[PDB]
Amino acid sequence: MRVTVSIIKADVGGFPGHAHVHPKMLEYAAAKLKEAQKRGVIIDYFVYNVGDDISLLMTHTKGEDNKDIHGLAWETFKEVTDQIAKRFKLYGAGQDLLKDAFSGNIRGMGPQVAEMEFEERPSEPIIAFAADKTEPGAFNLPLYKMFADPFTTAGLVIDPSMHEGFIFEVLDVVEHKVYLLKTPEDAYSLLGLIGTTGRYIIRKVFRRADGAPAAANSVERLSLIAGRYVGKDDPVLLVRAQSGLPAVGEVLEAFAHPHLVHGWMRGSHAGPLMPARFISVDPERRIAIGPKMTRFDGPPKVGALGFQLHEGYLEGGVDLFDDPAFDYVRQTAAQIADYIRRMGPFQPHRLPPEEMEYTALPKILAKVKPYPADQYEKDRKKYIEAVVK
Amino acid sequence: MRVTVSIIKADVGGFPGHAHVHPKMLEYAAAKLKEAQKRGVIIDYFVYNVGDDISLLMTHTKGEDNKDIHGLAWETFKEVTDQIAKRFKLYGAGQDLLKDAFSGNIRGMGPQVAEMEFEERPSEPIIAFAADKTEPGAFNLPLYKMFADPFTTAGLVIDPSMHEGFIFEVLDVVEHKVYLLKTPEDAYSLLGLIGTTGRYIIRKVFRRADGAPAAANSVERLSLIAGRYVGKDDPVLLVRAQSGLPAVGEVLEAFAHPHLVHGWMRGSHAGPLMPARFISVDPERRIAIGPKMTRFDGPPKVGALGFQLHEGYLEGGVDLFDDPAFDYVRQTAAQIADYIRRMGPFQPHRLPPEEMEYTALPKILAKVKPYPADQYEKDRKKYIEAVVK
Amino acid sequence: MRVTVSIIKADVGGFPGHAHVHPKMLEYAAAKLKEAQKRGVIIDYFVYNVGDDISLLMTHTKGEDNKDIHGLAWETFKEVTDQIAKRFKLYGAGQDLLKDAFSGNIRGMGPQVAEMEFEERPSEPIIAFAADKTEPGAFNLPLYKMFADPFTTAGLVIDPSMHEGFIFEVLDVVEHKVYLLKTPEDAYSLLGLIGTTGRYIIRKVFRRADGAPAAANSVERLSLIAGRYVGKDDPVLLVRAQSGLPAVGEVLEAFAHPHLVHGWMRGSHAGPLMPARFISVDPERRIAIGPKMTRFDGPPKVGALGFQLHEGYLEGGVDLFDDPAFDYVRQTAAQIADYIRRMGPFQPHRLPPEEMEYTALPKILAKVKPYPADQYEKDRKKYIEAVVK
Amino acid sequence: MRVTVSIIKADVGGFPGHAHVHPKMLEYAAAKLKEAQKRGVIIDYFVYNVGDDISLLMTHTKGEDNKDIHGLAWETFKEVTDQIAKRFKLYGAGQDLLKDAFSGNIRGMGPQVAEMEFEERPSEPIIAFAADKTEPGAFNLPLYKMFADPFTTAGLVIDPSMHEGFIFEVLDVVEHKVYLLKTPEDAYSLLGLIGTTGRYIIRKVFRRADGAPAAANSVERLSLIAGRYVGKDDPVLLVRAQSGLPAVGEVLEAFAHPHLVHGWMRGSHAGPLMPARFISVDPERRIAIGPKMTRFDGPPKVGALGFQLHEGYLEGGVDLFDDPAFDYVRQTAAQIADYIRRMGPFQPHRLPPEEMEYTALPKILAKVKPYPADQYEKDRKKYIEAVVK
Amino acid sequence: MRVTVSIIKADVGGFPGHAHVHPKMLEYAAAKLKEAQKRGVIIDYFVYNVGDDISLLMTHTKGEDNKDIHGLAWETFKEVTDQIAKRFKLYGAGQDLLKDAFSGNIRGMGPQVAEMEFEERPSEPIIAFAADKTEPGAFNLPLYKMFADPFTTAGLVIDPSMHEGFIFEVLDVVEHKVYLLKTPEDAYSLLGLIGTTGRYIIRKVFRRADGAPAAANSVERLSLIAGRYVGKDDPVLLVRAQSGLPAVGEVLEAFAHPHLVHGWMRGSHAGPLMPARFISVDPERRIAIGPKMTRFDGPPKVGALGFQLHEGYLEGGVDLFDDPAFDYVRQTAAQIADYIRRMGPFQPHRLPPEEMEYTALPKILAKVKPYPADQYEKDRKKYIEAVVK
Ligand SMILES: [Mg+2]
Ligand SMILES: [Mg+2]
Ligand SMILES: [Mg+2]
Ligand SMILES: [Mg+2]
Ligand SMILES: [Mg+2]
């Protein structure tokens, strides 16, 4: 049967600040999806956060971009906001709900969506990822590695079925243009685009042999609402694994180096993406509680829950960064976070001025007197004595 | 009384991919062996996985190579497959069940067997090991060290009762020949064979003083069924300890260096064997849940459960890698895994081409034009300009 | 007496590639300045490289921006180029000599200049720095720390004479505007500018108590010549120390964290600034040979030579990063270089696209077909089947 | 002008054992090439060892595979052998000189050759490498990375001139077949071959844009002479850098991970390739003394000397692994050597039995009685009691 | 020709204390052996220290235990003592010269001797070792490993010529008994003796195939002279390498773990044996200056000089611990020294009371009142109140 797997995620309130979610928020979302499941809206669901981002993972047969699935997640977030976040005066209550009324599609309203529809395979293993305190281009390097780096995914070289490579759908989120690139032939051009992780973001990946969908990363073109740019809020990512697609372990290997990503404190710094464990995973209650953000509102972290689909039912999730081999990767990330933080407010630890979520440049350039550099040279001495006097 | 201890193991489905087992699979196997115990088929049992490999450890008085014990494990695996793995569309559901019908002996049908029969001693401590993502020759180095390396087992030198050494039964799994070698005299010839861990595998070890059985490692001659070679699937290992045999701590010391073994991703790489803790051990329900495989489907891991036998009853199991002294060994293994993975698809991190579980060599040699090296030299320039043009 | 200390630096040829300088280049420059000294053009000099950048440090009484001092360095670089670099076909021979004819001022012709004129104090300790494979804003973080961070320079807090702070002259090299900011009051606005190290660069620093010059960093507004942007070539830096100015050790402390700077391979990456030893320092021949650039053309490195001035004579230089305490800082830098290099061509290890010295974006956007994102959505399936077929 | 650069290398005697060369051997070779230069046979030369391997690097205008250049190196090695190695009874005196008489071509007589002829560029930087205690496929991983891995060579992605990639000439040294593969399109097939580093070896690399030669690695088809296989003796490697070819730093970056290579003790183990410094480099005497091999006859080491060519003259060499950034890489290599050595004689630290330089398998299989595995099972008890009695 | 290689060593004065030797002492010894060589007493020589121990290495054709060679070393030590050590009032001047008059044999007079006579092979590589601040049983573990541990010397397993193993001549230095043990068969009994490194010391090793001498370690039965025990003064060790004997690298591998040895401060502690570099090796002057002993008079250190013999002439020496791979081993030794020193005067960091070079037990038991334990119990209260009052 064809099945759609959708992750719809928002930050609708933190506890405290942007450190984590209030557990009643997940409990409320899970009870609400349980009712949708009883009514036949969806087949199955799993609710979880990483930091203060909540992901609603839902399986159903209504296809991609479906009004009722998008509206169900909208209402679940609205209700969590009204009944829990506003009630407890959570920090940034309702923050990612940026319109008063649902239009038909949740994309561009604040929440992030990653979804794929496909024929359910004889075994259908999938992994859902959520990263907090970063942007969707944080997954550019791991998506490139798992689908196109033969030092990550050994099947590209030793598995006859993966020899033909993959198709990447890359969104320019500034000029709203899509590029389709194919590896191995196009790997250098692809990198020339996706290395600029704030602008050119891998949105989907397809198997080249047959076009099957292999991954979907949540990203939208930038738009402006109120003060705010939307499109590059903290991402969620779905990946199908095995049988012509990368093995679950090749997918996870692509996260084994905790690379520097943009976001962290005030969406304005770069720091290492730490692959973190969930605090708890309860497959019976359909709820996982993910890790907190602490020093400097991070470092940014990514969680991974693996599932096996059967007729759309989600058996899991399984925390796939729970292994002493990944402790070494978390230890490297903790040490790199401490190293780069000693840089304080300088690039490249602080982001490039056009990529900053926060600025006071406006207020500075309004108080500090500029001198044309030509005239300044002639008068340096006067200017300095003036400042001294 | 004489007692037989048998471990029969298979991979019959993973969750997700090859990362772990579904816990209902162990619960079902344990309830099924509990019924066999009620009917008097076996005395006692313990069910556990490491990665996606399930071990059925059973004690009974039917001797080695027994049709009813082998058939009981066959049916338990078949039923787990039909009722749980196929139901949840687990990855590689039934993978190690390679014939439609049980012949009398489970050896050579896919599952691995290690078993010993002996007079139960006044104290009978034993250790059961299971390693996932490797081959039976992974235990060649630890078996050699615990029975013949005086830097591992101090009793060889300071215990008068162990001075006469041990007999190793070594299977050439390619030409189906058995060698019997005795240490200390034959240590260099033994090493000359078992250093080739993909071909010459220690299958049993006996005490030289009296012939008592000391260890049994699961290994079978290679055969071909369907696409597949069988014999060298992930191994299980039984070792008896103390009183003329190595102490429990000398047995564990032989795993204290996390040596490089063959297997890991796609059965086609080498990586360190990490001695891992079980996630949980429940001696009342007769079930232990072992560690996951994560980055690159590993690294390979070995678990150890110790037991004391009384009239065949299994008091335990006790996780014998649960000690801060072994954290240092897991930390070394995590760091070596990260180091060797930077080698990507090159030997010796990728295995020798004859030892590979996976290859695309076939597909490559069918697309890439070879030039005889003699003629090539004469025409190099033409050939290169041709490629350039 | 008033004395001018000028450092004029260029890269005029590498050996091999951009790894180092040919030692005859320093020998020729030193013999040429020795002749200028005999003729009374300058008082004293010291010639040295870091990587493939040669610094001519000269002391004289002709003031800042002097035609004869700038012309002497021009001719010395021209002659080194003609007689040594072109002769040995050195890589990038004459690279920083970007006009055919000297105009009066070497600034904006390719070479970098840092110079200060002042009354020579009763003791006049100064430090000259040269960094290779980075931009002048690499010194923004150390200049800020040594003059305004009380965790670096303890005299700001415990030395009554430094309590009034410093004046920073900050050049916007894009719009050619100068800002004058004073610490402590203006520290947050200053950081808001100089954190953008590619655009707002500290060019001079003055003591606030009396206006005395304290530091000069080589930086020019950006201009275009041939293919090339000039202004942000590898910098050189002069700092006066002690008696109301930071102690020599507070100046060096500002380099004790090897922060990430822009440059390294192809002027297009970020990597740690390693404080390196000179290979040799010969105070009698007036020549120091600085460190090589190796992996990935770096990592970027900074050398420090301290001098005591007497009547303009330069007693030194002394390698001031030659101490086991700085080995720990070099070890951190080597480890961070290895960590960040695993990021390959992704930001923030690769620079922001507007800050890149190298791009192939042009060639990419000319070969890869863009689809308007709106229409693309409607037709995704057609587009993918097309790519697959 | 067209120039040929040739490295011809042999081991003709060690001091002591296989640890290093006697310095008189390099002095004699240098005086002999100085005479050839005086007679106009060659333009310029540099003589150096790494471990007990001596490289004669010569520049000349006689093209590749030239009888007089090959014969000059033959005679230089013969004379070093007769006058120095035999005189001092050096270990393996003349070892790589495997015929009594020179045939016209030194290839296949024992010594290794890497050579390229090309038009000398406006700047012609090149690097010569020599590795001791390994095989030519040791350079497969670094050659692949510097010409085809965009995580090593950033110019593949950001340098428009390198976008078209490279052509690899791969020798199957077992069946004497050449493959020509082009990256990026053919990267997975190339890896599928060169990952088997003992059989498929990169021999040359060409720029795809124009066919220019970019690298030459010393490798010959296997042949048998006396007891001995020739073709895979310790290799030497030439690489041209910059301007469409990888920068000197991208070439060195490809050695920044000290990957496991085959060779080390008795040509029969795997251990990390350590990038080592030369003990001394004397550009005036044309002699560099490279590092010793110590524990376990290694670990294997590679040295790198960079040169700038002018009319064929070799200005250099410059030790390009002499940088604190590479100390961290040597420290990793020393730690991995200590880790893997604890494996003693087991694969994969000992090589696969078909790849071994040394075996005693012959002598073992002649003393140890094999039992057919079928009959053995029936009689195990008799066999063990027999051994015990 | 048959050649004898003899090392005769003594400590005859330290500079300062027991930290090193005065360099004039080596210069005087070298000039004296140069005269003996001119007179034809010996063929060739090399003079060197490690710590405050001087080794005279001499080659000659007078066989083992020769009066004129032993007397030449006696007189050289006497003269160094009279002319240099007494002149400069060096610490422990003449300390190891324990009789007034030479008897014919230097063994048992204080100096240590290791010597072997053999037919000089077609290549005759040998290594001379000297360890300071330890006893001859310090070399028990490395001699056992290089001749009998297949995890150290891979030739035992893969070299048909070494398959038959070795004969160890073990001296019980307490009861003056010799044992002859052969490996592999006798390895456990051998270890049962030589594990007691203060009593049973390997003195010689012979190849089992033909009886050829392979090593000689300096050790004598204990005797008493004046206050002093002689026999176990700091040792020197000769080893022949290659061709049926362990390769030079297998010999050095046996020192790659810096094991704990007895000696260090006051000959009364245990600490790690650090494999150290020589400060300088001058093959023309026949002199090497070895490392100092510093913290706590150590840690104990071993130096290794390799030579190639030709007609008895000593070409070398070559410092065979000079390799970054051994820096890691020195770093481990420095860290273990710091760890164990925090134990202060407790076993096992302080030696067992019968193995102590120093004791004050005598003086203690003469001041401290013992109470019979039986009566003490009855009266504890009285005894304590007495002490308190
Ligand atoms: Mg968030
Ligand atoms: Mg398995
Ligand atoms: Mg430069
Ligand atoms: Mg060699
Ligand atoms: Mg001493």
Short mmCIF file of C-alpha atoms in Angstrom, two decimals, chain B residues 46-267:
data_model
loop_
_atom_site.label_atom_id
_atom_site.label_comp_id
_atom_site.label_asym_id
_atom_site.label_seq_id
_atom_site.Cartn_x
_atom_site.Cartn_y
_atom_site.Cartn_z
CA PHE B 46 18.09 -17.47 29.08
CA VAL B 47 17.16 -15.38 26.03
CA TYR B 48 19.15 -12.26 24.95
CA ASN B 49 20.38 -10.33 21.95
CA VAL B 50 23.50 -8.34 21.04
CA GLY B 51 22.59 -6.09 18.13
CA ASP B 52 20.07 -7.89 15.91
CA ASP B 53 21.29 -11.42 16.89
CA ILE B 54 19.15 -13.44 19.31
CA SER B 55 20.79 -16.15 21.45
CA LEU B 56 18.74 -18.98 23.03
CA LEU B 57 20.86 -20.36 25.82
CA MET B 58 19.42 -23.70 27.02
CA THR B 59 20.54 -26.28 29.50
CA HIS B 60 19.23 -29.91 29.14
CA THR B 61 20.43 -33.52 29.33
CA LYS B 62 19.97 -34.54 25.64
CA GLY B 63 23.64 -34.22 24.67
CA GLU B 64 25.28 -32.32 21.70
CA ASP B 65 23.76 -32.24 18.24
CA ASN B 66 20.38 -33.26 19.59
CA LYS B 67 17.42 -33.19 17.17
CA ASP B 68 14.90 -32.10 19.77
CA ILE B 69 17.02 -29.20 21.14
CA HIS B 70 18.04 -28.05 17.63
CA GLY B 71 14.38 -28.43 16.52
CA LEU B 72 13.08 -26.55 19.53
CA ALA B 73 15.40 -23.54 18.64
CA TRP B 74 14.39 -23.91 14.91
CA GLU B 75 10.71 -23.70 15.78
CA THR B 76 11.23 -20.87 18.29
CA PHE B 77 13.05 -18.82 15.50
CA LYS B 78 10.35 -19.81 12.92
CA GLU B 79 7.59 -18.70 15.21
CA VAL B 80 9.33 -15.41 16.20
CA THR B 81 9.73 -14.81 12.45
CA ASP B 82 6.06 -15.59 11.58
CA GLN B 83 4.35 -13.97 14.53
CA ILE B 84 6.61 -10.94 15.22
CA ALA B 85 9.15 -10.19 12.48
CA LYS B 86 6.80 -10.62 9.50
CA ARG B 87 3.99 -9.02 11.36
CA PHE B 88 6.03 -5.84 11.97
CA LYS B 89 7.85 -6.11 8.59
CA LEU B 90 11.21 -6.15 10.48
CA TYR B 91 14.30 -5.74 8.39
CA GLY B 92 15.75 -9.12 7.23
CA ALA B 93 12.74 -10.96 8.75
CA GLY B 94 13.69 -14.70 8.94
CA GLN B 95 17.06 -13.86 7.42
CA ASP B 96 19.04 -16.73 9.00
CA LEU B 97 16.38 -19.40 8.39
CA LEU B 98 17.73 -20.72 5.04
CA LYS B 99 15.77 -23.98 4.41
CA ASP B 100 12.02 -24.51 4.38
CA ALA B 101 12.21 -27.70 6.55
CA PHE B 102 14.21 -28.94 9.63
CA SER B 103 16.45 -31.94 8.75
CA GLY B 104 17.48 -33.12 12.25
CA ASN B 105 20.43 -30.68 12.79
CA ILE B 106 20.24 -26.87 12.79
CA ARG B 107 24.01 -26.55 11.82
CA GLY B 108 24.36 -25.41 8.19
CA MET B 109 20.72 -24.10 8.02
CA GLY B 110 21.79 -20.52 9.02
CA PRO B 111 21.66 -20.43 12.87
CA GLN B 112 24.85 -20.73 14.86
CA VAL B 113 25.42 -23.32 17.61
CA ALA B 114 27.93 -23.58 20.38
CA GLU B 115 27.36 -26.44 22.85
CA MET B 116 29.25 -28.55 25.33
CA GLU B 117 28.28 -31.56 27.45
CA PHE B 118 30.20 -32.33 30.66
CA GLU B 119 29.85 -33.57 34.23
CA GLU B 120 28.60 -30.61 36.23
CA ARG B 121 31.41 -29.61 38.65
CA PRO B 122 31.03 -28.93 42.43
CA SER B 123 30.97 -25.27 41.19
CA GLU B 124 30.30 -24.83 37.48
CA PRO B 125 30.82 -21.20 36.42
CA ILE B 126 30.39 -20.55 32.74
CA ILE B 127 30.27 -17.48 30.47
CA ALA B 128 28.22 -17.10 27.35
CA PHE B 129 29.35 -14.54 24.72
CA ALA B 130 27.53 -13.19 21.69
CA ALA B 131 29.20 -10.82 19.15
CA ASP B 132 27.19 -8.97 16.48
CA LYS B 133 28.58 -7.62 13.11
CA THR B 134 31.49 -10.04 12.95
CA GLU B 135 32.55 -13.58 12.06
CA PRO B 136 33.44 -16.54 14.27
CA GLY B 137 37.19 -15.89 13.76
CA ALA B 138 36.64 -12.70 15.78
CA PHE B 139 37.00 -14.96 18.80
CA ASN B 140 40.25 -16.49 17.59
CA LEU B 141 42.43 -13.87 19.23
CA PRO B 142 40.53 -13.91 22.66
CA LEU B 143 40.41 -17.79 22.72
CA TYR B 144 44.08 -18.00 21.97
CA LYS B 145 44.90 -15.44 24.63
CA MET B 146 42.71 -16.91 27.48
CA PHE B 147 44.06 -20.50 26.87
CA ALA B 148 47.60 -19.90 25.70
CA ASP B 149 48.93 -16.30 26.32
CA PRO B 150 50.67 -16.10 29.74
CA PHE B 151 50.37 -12.25 29.53
CA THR B 152 46.52 -12.84 29.72
CA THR B 153 46.11 -15.87 31.85
CA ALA B 154 48.44 -15.85 34.74
CA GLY B 155 47.33 -19.44 35.79
CA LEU B 156 49.33 -20.94 32.86
CA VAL B 157 52.41 -19.88 34.77
CA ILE B 158 51.47 -19.78 38.45
CA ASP B 159 48.76 -22.50 38.71
CA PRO B 160 50.28 -26.02 38.77
CA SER B 161 46.99 -27.44 37.54
CA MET B 162 47.10 -25.50 34.15
CA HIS B 163 50.75 -26.08 33.41
CA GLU B 164 50.06 -28.76 30.83
CA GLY B 165 48.12 -26.41 28.53
CA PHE B 166 45.23 -26.96 26.14
CA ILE B 167 44.10 -28.63 22.97
CA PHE B 168 42.61 -26.51 20.23
CA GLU B 169 40.33 -27.90 17.61
CA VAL B 170 40.73 -25.69 14.58
CA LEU B 171 38.31 -25.91 11.62
CA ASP B 172 39.47 -24.95 8.10
CA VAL B 173 36.15 -23.83 6.94
CA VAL B 174 37.22 -23.61 3.22
CA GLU B 175 38.61 -27.15 2.67
CA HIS B 176 36.58 -28.72 5.62
CA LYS B 177 39.66 -30.10 7.52
CA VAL B 178 40.19 -30.20 11.29
CA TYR B 179 43.52 -29.62 13.01
CA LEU B 180 44.30 -30.48 16.58
CA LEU B 181 47.02 -28.39 18.09
CA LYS B 182 48.37 -28.34 21.65
CA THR B 183 49.89 -25.42 23.54
CA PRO B 184 52.48 -24.51 24.64
CA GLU B 185 54.52 -26.70 22.14
CA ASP B 186 52.41 -25.99 19.08
CA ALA B 187 51.65 -22.23 19.74
CA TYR B 188 53.53 -20.96 16.69
CA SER B 189 51.89 -23.35 14.26
CA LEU B 190 48.50 -22.73 15.82
CA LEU B 191 49.01 -18.94 15.30
CA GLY B 192 50.17 -19.53 11.77
CA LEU B 193 46.74 -20.99 11.11
CA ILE B 194 44.31 -18.97 13.32
CA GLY B 195 45.85 -15.57 12.40
CA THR B 196 43.92 -16.15 9.13
CA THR B 197 40.66 -15.57 10.99
CA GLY B 198 38.39 -15.92 7.95
CA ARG B 199 39.52 -19.46 7.17
CA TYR B 200 40.94 -21.26 10.25
CA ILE B 201 38.68 -20.86 13.24
CA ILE B 202 39.01 -22.27 16.78
CA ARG B 203 35.88 -24.37 17.21
CA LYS B 204 36.55 -26.14 20.52
CA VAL B 205 39.13 -26.12 23.25
CA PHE B 206 39.91 -28.99 25.67
CA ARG B 207 41.94 -29.18 28.79
CA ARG B 208 45.12 -31.24 28.03
CA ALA B 209 45.34 -32.78 31.55
CA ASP B 210 42.10 -34.84 31.15
CA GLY B 211 40.44 -33.79 27.88
CA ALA B 212 37.66 -31.86 29.70
CA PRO B 213 35.79 -29.48 27.32
CA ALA B 214 36.77 -25.85 28.09
CA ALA B 215 35.15 -23.80 25.23
CA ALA B 216 32.99 -24.09 22.16
CA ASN B 217 32.78 -21.37 19.48
CA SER B 218 30.00 -21.48 16.81
CA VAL B 219 31.50 -22.11 13.36
CA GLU B 220 30.58 -24.38 10.35
CA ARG B 221 32.38 -25.22 7.09
CA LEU B 222 31.33 -22.79 4.33
CA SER B 223 28.44 -23.96 2.09
CA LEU B 224 26.37 -22.15 -0.56
CA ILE B 225 22.56 -21.74 -0.30
CA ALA B 226 20.64 -19.37 -2.68
CA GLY B 227 23.00 -16.33 -3.12
CA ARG B 228 24.46 -16.97 0.29
CA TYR B 229 27.54 -18.39 2.06
CA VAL B 230 26.74 -19.86 5.46
CA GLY B 231 29.13 -20.88 8.28
CA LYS B 232 30.57 -17.49 9.29
CA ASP B 233 27.44 -15.64 10.48
CA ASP B 234 27.85 -13.66 13.82
CA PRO B 235 29.17 -16.04 16.44
CA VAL B 236 28.28 -17.19 19.99
CA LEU B 237 30.82 -18.70 22.37
CA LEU B 238 30.65 -20.75 25.61
CA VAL B 239 33.52 -20.90 28.07
CA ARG B 240 33.81 -22.82 31.36
CA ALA B 241 35.90 -21.18 34.00
CA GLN B 242 38.01 -21.83 37.16
CA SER B 243 39.71 -24.94 38.71
CA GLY B 244 42.20 -25.87 36.07
CA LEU B 245 40.42 -23.72 33.48
CA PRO B 246 41.04 -19.94 33.19
CA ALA B 247 39.45 -17.85 35.95
CA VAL B 248 36.43 -15.80 34.97
CA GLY B 249 38.71 -12.71 35.10
CA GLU B 250 41.35 -14.32 32.78
CA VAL B 251 38.61 -15.14 30.33
CA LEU B 252 37.41 -11.46 30.41
CA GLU B 253 41.01 -10.10 30.26
CA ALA B 254 41.23 -11.76 26.83
CA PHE B 255 38.66 -9.16 25.65
CA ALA B 256 40.30 -6.19 27.32
CA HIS B 257 42.03 -5.09 24.11
CA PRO B 258 39.31 -4.20 21.55
CA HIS B 259 41.10 -5.84 18.58
CA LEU B 260 40.16 -5.23 14.94
CA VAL B 261 37.74 -7.92 13.60
CA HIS B 262 36.12 -8.51 10.20
CA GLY B 263 32.44 -7.65 9.64
CA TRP B 264 30.85 -4.28 10.58
CA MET B 265 29.02 -2.53 7.70
CA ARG B 266 27.84 -4.96 4.91
CA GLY B 267 30.07 -7.75 6.47
#
